[model samples]
Target: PKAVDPFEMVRKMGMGTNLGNTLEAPYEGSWSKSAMEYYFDDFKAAGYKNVRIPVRWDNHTMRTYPYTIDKAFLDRVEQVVDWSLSRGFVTIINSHHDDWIKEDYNGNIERFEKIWEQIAERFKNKSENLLFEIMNEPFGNITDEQIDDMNSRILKIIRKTNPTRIVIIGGGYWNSYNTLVNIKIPDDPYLIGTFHYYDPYEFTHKWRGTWGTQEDMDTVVRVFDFVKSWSDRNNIPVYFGAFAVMAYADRTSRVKWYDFISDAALERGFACSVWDNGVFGDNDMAIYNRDTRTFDTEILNALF
Candidate 1:
């Protein structure tokens, strides 16, 4: 059999969704309605081919220098990672909600390096079905060159423990499309560049008081063409790591954006992952209902 590269593996992943709100939440029960296991079964059976578990390691780790992550926490996180991978779905685990990563690349390298070291060491033996994202949505006075340098340092640490393991990285400014185009992807073939999409932020993040106007809606699918062109030019696979509109938007409008976004990405050879934190109520983008193991069929069908 021929070997499978990251590109081919991601294609198999196809349409996917994020396991947001759980691990990234202040506590496990705070966001998830039930055990993590059943939710994934819901994901796999419902046609999602991949899952991204965004965890805030900082919340569970020591606050002092060396900032070690708790053993029990690592075990719990590993257990969730295994649930998806064991079922043959692509799984990505990454450090999220971490605010300590400074932009100057000056003050916080120590804690940052230790975090990756521990994470890399723990999952070093996992199969190719697993991927480790370096960080999530970097912010606060960070420069493109600083992000490039920071990623390089973390990449080296991961390489030491998991030499050939696939790793994901995004540019500064919260993986903004323009900034993503600036960061340099090194020669490592196992690397995947990532960026999040909420182009018409007003509509997607309506709860935040932004105007969800019709003009903002026009750029929905148009922003992707620029990302596609960049990915092809760089000869690197780009992960459409996150995209979704809030539930406040009516069902019809939500479905339209979801369908258009997923198709735009798939047609361009990029993988799409919807953002759903499992809240099926007002103001949030919750597609899957845990209790029923059902999703908004309109939204679910759009993704499929």
Candidate 2:
């Protein structure tokens, strides 16, 4: 499966800047057109073949009775999928950062069952290129028991519609890498372990307004290596969270970041994705992409 790189796929689609809020916030349907268009062709140009769309699920919920989403919102998301798939790219869609993911929903098993039933029946006939991630980063009072139980219900729902769609699931701590060990996935051939790594969050997210500047980026590099090695030992595959490269620092010393990356490659030999903010977006091409879609070369290209 020589799929398109997920980072570039998302960047071309306007990831971080557009999404990532609770459904209660400003409307999410107002995505940038430039982002979508770039996603279609820029992905191809950049040589990336797959796109993971991260949409906050809680914001659009009905709150009380039914946790149904607005028709317009689902339609908008569907259209985005259409754009990416129409161009022949693998698409991953999930319930990202939803509100119910908190403690309340965990105790309410009935709602969980209903939610998945709707999602399953929604995209039953979509192309095989499509994928579903259960909940972006489940948190709150939710426990391992809840994750297994609710996800079990949801998985049944999804299977009914898209029988074999590639489904992803993440643990608490905003889907942190450390949360995976606590999960007990139900028996399924299609299930894939999902983990997000922002280890030493201080480094990569230093300038990130939310995760705090105290996180050490250097620590995450080591964290990723450890996860990779552990995954190999356990005979399981891994899906990495984005936070691979950061541009919070000055541009003059950008090339030095590659040293950090090489360190990880040497230590763990990561074969999967290291999630980032999709694309560099002209912010720092030196550390992000050097037009790898067509060039497949380093952005720094011998620059020291």
Candidate 3:
């Protein structure tokens, strides 16, 4: 197989959605239902070209040295990844909600590397379309400097097994674009920069106000423009990993928010994955309803 150019790889990824709140939860069905294989079929049918699977290993791994991940959990994740790949979607899997490392890096660095080493080795022979995002969102006490160091170290471990496989890296501070701009990307060919976007958290999360004002739209444009400039200067393709508004927000404004952000990301040549946790009721950010196996048509249209 020919090596894929990093930029071209991201371009092929196109519009994507996250399998959120599933494996990333403390347990598969703790926060949301476990992801089903049919969901990938639905995603592909709906014209999604990428799937980002956020997984939590902290609870699944042994608490002692070598910190082995549970075999069943590892196999379950591989099955999900395989389903996405078989459907021809670019798949991304990452360490998510592993605050153990972020809150105490010095105490947990070895365990963290062991987890990645296992993950890298496990998927080393998988299709190149499968990408590894080192961590989901490093925040709180995790500084940009610490993230830089971790990025370098983790990439080295991944390189030993999967030298040419694409790897995604992000910055500290919840993987925000501002924090993204501050980190130094590692010198590697098969690397993609990633950041999460849910700006004006009050609107997206707290439902304090609605979105779609002129000022609101410009805020997205300005930040995306800044990210584009940084990506251009650094010569790294970027992925807008996660963004969405809760279902309880103003319906009209919520749809418009999706429309504007997805458009803005594509206009800047960045591939993005909207956050969908598969919960369809109040205080949720789901665009896909797992039980009904249907998409929220308005948000779906906006994203595509």
TM-score of each: 0.87, 0.66, 0.92
lDDT of 2 by residue, 201-227 (tens): 534543443221224444555466565
Off by over 4 Å in 1: 1-3, 103-105, 171-180, 198-218, 245-248
- Give lDDT for model 3: 0.83
Each candidate: what lDDT? 0.74, 0.50, 0.83
Candidate 1 lDDT tens digits, 64-115: 7878989999999999898988887899999787766653247777887888
In model 1, the Cα lDDT at residue 254 comes to 70
Ranking by lDDT: 3, 1, 2
Distance from true location, Cα of 252 in model 2, Å = 5.3
Top-TM-score candidate index: 3
Residue pairs of candidate 1 with colliding backbone atoms? none
Worst 10 residues of 2 by lDDT: 15-24
User: How many pairs of residues in model 3 come into backbone collision?
Assistant: 0
Worst 10-residue lDDT window, candidate 3: 171-180
